[model samples]
Target: TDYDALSCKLAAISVGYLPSSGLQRLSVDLSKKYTEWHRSYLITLKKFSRRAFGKVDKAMRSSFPVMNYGTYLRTVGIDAAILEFLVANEKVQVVNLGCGSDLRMLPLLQMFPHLAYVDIDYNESVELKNSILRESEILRISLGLSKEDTAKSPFLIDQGRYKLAACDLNDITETTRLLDVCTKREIPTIVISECLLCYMHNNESQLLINTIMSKFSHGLWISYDPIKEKYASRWSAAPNVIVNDMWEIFNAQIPESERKRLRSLQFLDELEELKVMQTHYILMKAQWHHH
Candidate 1:
């Protein structure tokens, strides 16, 4: 199921973004808080050993640069919009879809305290990430990097203020309930889904979009995912076929065919059909305001 594959792809990209050091930090919590080499090895091994390959996917869609480049671009655009809105609006609510290891929003919130950030992902992702946050505290002692020194370290901790919400978009009802609860607030909202939609079946993606458009009615829908072309097939192939095959095979939970099917190729077309602006790396930001 491509929808399911996209779910796995989301997780893969999350794991791929971390360097060996970051991976060690992950092991601290994933290994069950047993702060030692034994636990660390187990954490790293489970991650690399294909054990993290559940049924196998970390990212649902292909992310070129195989890094969190999508997050970098989307967050910037999103934050820019937030800053703009903040100039006139009293407060803004931003929902981060598929929020994997993202700390950029944290810093932005620090800059603008009126902004409220909510990070949503699957339960497992939320669990691991929550553990990482808890374990991040221990990292300072082990690595001799204090909280004050966190600014100097590569991993940023200044993401202002945010509430981490565990949201599984796959479950539309729960997602809608979350939206309904948040919409009752006074803040204008921005929904940021980076490389998350393509992992869902087109029907599911449409359902999600419909829900957002209906509920938020007065905000922006900003996201990025892969849209295929003849050239894209070849370009993306370089990674899927040549460079990242081993990585994908080891990291993927399902077979390759299953993974590719669920991506939102047509949905990308639909955005174009709606005349939404397209950018490099399939960046599309569409805004719908309901009065």
Candidate 2:
């Protein structure tokens, strides 16, 4: 379970999610340094096993090029959806469900200052992010959250438009309750679940989705699930659902300029294999509110 978080971070690092190029800025740099420290902290706590680190390191050396390419598409496609929603609305709250090692919160905060960001994850993951923001001027200043020698710390984030919750989506109740207070009901909201729903049992997943949608009066739920079959029916039951395999997303939704940029970084070695890999993975967009 925890490995997914660390592994995603590795994929992000591979595809320049943190970025080593000249385009890099302090917001990204701080989160990058924070996660790096987080890894070290785990090693110290005997939390991140050596075997897991070695396995990830091996993959880092020789991961499939398409794997890297897929990471870029999923990341960028989700961003495109978020930006489109943000640009169209005057005020927006982007809720990231089960967000693990996803560093876009900081950079996205910078890109759209009027935006509200909520990152919900397990305790371990949220703690890492909290430590990062607590020490750095980047997230603290940009988000206007937390300070040194604070009179109080909630152990959970409850300040300004930027909020973090250590919640189990399976619990469903806690997630709903937390957002009730933190998020605004009237404004447009975008809920992101990038490869998140796959982790829960079918019944639990269904219940969670149904409950979350009911909680938000108006918004879009952008779920990036790694699935097929009946789960598509989950969104099919809802109005304005656009479900496509990552292959379709890669070919159509993503910008050509960005795809060219990826090709420049690393040549795709297996076109046939890439299609097979991507066609199996799905990117889902479901809208519950009318424009």
Candidate 3:
């Protein structure tokens, strides 16, 4: 294991039992399980995500600092608000879009079982996760966990009842299809876009928004990204855009086939244009039905 390589088998094995055993006390069994399997895997996920970002930063060194410390802080605040919303609201579907390697779903599912959970990401992301979780865990306890046991861990999907879907968010056709599935379910859902949407061209991102509007009549999008003026803005913090551009040029890579995610203030601009999005974390939440 390169310390960062994803091991789907281990991730699946660890997450499979979450629903049942998630609320129990951090006991010998949990500790052993965490130590033997889950902890290292989570560590690896964090490590990998950071390293991937590091490469982007190295390439962007000239324009700004590699990391946007302020953006990270703002994201935490945005994440908190989402949690609060989940805690108070009942029976909503929470869709974590472009989830990357975040462990947020675990916490939300555990805290709000009343809410249906959906994790949507690129096929590569989801498939890799599924493979690591090849088989399920034998839950030692009942899935119906009591509240008292859950207070300790307000994060992590303590259970595994959630659905994971593959979404090419950049593809209007595919993104529309995924949103339509939720619409058919007649579920009130919240879409989470964290730390993405800042690296894309302005107009294509608008198309993504259009996709959401076309598909769902009732939903909110809660996203997290750095503001353009901030040091952490992807354009500034992500090293030399020229170098990045050159790399693509040198490779003759139009790379439409690769998953497309961008970070830009265009989302805010669009939401203002539509006048429906409530700003959160340089990311904004757009609700089709204003309530």
Candidate 4:
């Protein structure tokens, strides 16, 4: 089952990031949408509630400052990348691969109205998300739907800016089919893989990336993984790469002024501890021109 204790705990931990300030107009709007999605997920993840939800909820109520700092890094780091890409190319396509319980679709579509964004997750994850999207009045009003507009099936959104696609990435054939059918291969594309690729078998995951890059004309992949790359062998096809790990991000991306602001939010025990933890986690921006 994909709805495991770790997943529930991560959601609970995310509750901590919701209340932070310093968001500009668009970020603020995103915060609100995330809150809406969070509220719904917490209530509706039935597998979670029966077992780990309450206990994890209580523990994460005082989630660690280090965790919060890491959350800030993950959220704002990848976020800034995509937003920058969107700004440069408004007529681009975005895919959230293994996008479980993430709430970015609403905010991104709202910010860049009618932007094509597809979120791919497992069947259970997709069904749950679709049900929430269908019932969400905020979504309805945002998308300008008629009162009678009913969710068709599987897809939370279709022929609209956003699409909820369900498939197992481990199944390369199905994933390849889905991408070709649901996406425009001509458009410049971005595939976001946050702790997603590492979940599949090594050879299978490599093949998945190959399929993705081969399908799209121009592609940029932003991925994060817990373990260091044991075999990042195949992406050698990608001529350009930016390995922006957490240590690098903190030094290069997070300015001192911003660091001060984060300091006020939570007191980190030691700077070294933060750095070490950040080092273990990784972020890479690898791009390619398809053959």
Candidate 5:
């Protein structure tokens, strides 16, 4: 499945995307509109989405078996913390690397009207997402695009506040070109690489990190990826940063109240299972200083 791009994306949607979508639907902290949006997306996918789930009769059957409902809650919980931190200020730019089929931007843009949101992915995935958005009247209106604006170019959607672009992150030139939409270099930027870097080679991942560091003058780069052994990387060189495994940060980011709520929804009491899960993932946070 790793060798096949289609299967890889299908597995992503099944294990990562679908579960998070469901969790957000059930979350007490997330906006009801966002939850409904995800519900609508799920319904659309179950019926007509031909991108990720078309090959299989059932999405869950095609997904990687490693992830479960508990894992979904944990991952989305951590992501919520990162998102809230990024949108705390009135004005900021957010770039979602390998954005996949994630529908986070719609509600996020509505929440922070001053925010500039960009979702980047391979051309094929972006095209599929745009097609879905076009077909779903609910999604189109949620993006605040009129009938005419929604009917524009396939690759780019410049709706004033939110934009989508296609770019191969491994290529620095293409990445820089797509990011040029954020014209103000001085504005704080948050680059999110959620479960993306692990798929690329170490060199390719480092190239992306370097490209982002050199491209954005100030702001945070929060990465969530799997860790095998020790943590060592050039990302640590950034000012005011910490590169730690997910287990440590998970407790800090997810409060006790949330934990209880998650357990109530889906309980996993086995300590060994929790340990195995935590050991496999890590979160890297790096904040660059600007003068």
Candidate 6:
């Protein structure tokens, strides 16, 4: 069935949903990255998102359905935390696993110029993003790359601060190879896996998690995943753990001004479905800093 492949394909729903719903703006312009036609294609996908069950209100005033909206809130909150921590500790390196077309690096570098950032994803996904980059002068200028440099290999780039690698996370060899870019042993690192591990079997996900924890001298791991209760036993050694449903974490972490604005858009119509879905998903933050 290749369920993993299907899951990865569907992952873009969240990406398109955010901008189409107007909850956030794209730091990188996908339209200019690809073509003007690409924008409408993305809107079509957002309008018919399976996560929302064909319920996303496209009127611009109502935003997405409950489940989709909640997911966006949780994601933005986590992204904010990542930026805050990286800014506070400028020397730390950040690695994103299965980073499918996420534009976070643009803003992260804007705030902290010298901080290191690495993004890894499957070849298929990575190739598409790389292709888009080839056509994008805006992104090239933003990354401080000459137009000539954009024609270079997208799989590996060393502008001295940012890197993008293609890898299958399920393979331990590939995972280690990707992590090799952050070569310094003592540099504090943060690894993020947003909805990436849930599709893999427990053993596979654990191996990747354990590898990061053991390889880095001092680091933090932030994961947004569903079905966390099934693997609760494996994370006991982590210094801190906050196991909460998406709704709880969203309300607790999202800022008041933003929360008020979100509410002003429109009330979610599916309360029962929202409660059911939010309960199964969780936001977990774990730190491993050995003295």
List candidate 6 stretches off by more than 4 Å: 1-63, 149-154, 269-271
Task: Give the number of the best model, judged by TM-score.
Answer: 4
**Cα lDDT of model 3 by residue, 72-181, tens digit:** 22333345446555655676777676765444454455456676776667776765444333222322121333323231121222334555567677777776665555
Write candidate 2's Cα lDDT for 211-268 as tens digits: 7777676888887766555556786546788778888887887565656666677777
| Candidate 3 structure lDDT | 0.43
Q: Is candidate 4 or candidate 6 better by lDDT?
A: 4
Clashes of each: 25, 0, 28, 0, 0, 0
Give per-residue CA lDDT, model 6, range 1-291, as digits (tens).
122222222332423433322223334453233223333323433433444223322322232356455545555657656766675678878888877756667656765766888888877666655545444556655666654544334354556677777778888997786577455668888888877886788889888888888888887777776676545546667866656677776667656665555555555654677777777777777776776
Q: Candidate 1 residues 1-291, lDDT tens each?
A: 322323433433343322111212233243332323222322432443354433323333444332332332233334444555556655777887887745445334434557777778776565554444434544323333334523311123223345556666988988887666444433577777767876788777777777766666456555556552431232221222111211222223224432233232211222232222223344344555556
lDDT of 5 by residue, 133-250 (tens): 6666788788876656443443467778778778888888888776764446878888888768877888888888887777777878877766622443557658676665656654
| Segments in model 3 whose C-alpha atoms lie over 4 Å from true places | 1-40, 43-75, 135-160, 182-186, 228-291
Q: Which has the better lDDT: candidate 2, or candidate 3? A: 2
TM-score list, all predictions = 0.51, 0.80, 0.50, 0.84, 0.79, 0.75
Tell me the lDDT of candidate 2: 0.68
lDDT of 1 at 242: 17
- Collision pairs in model 6: none
Model 3 TM-score, all chains together: 0.50
* Whole-model lDDT values for every prediction: 0.46, 0.68, 0.43, 0.69, 0.63, 0.61
**lDDT (0-100) at residue 4 of candidate 3?**
20
Candidate number with greatest lDDT: 4
TM-score, candidate number 4: 0.84
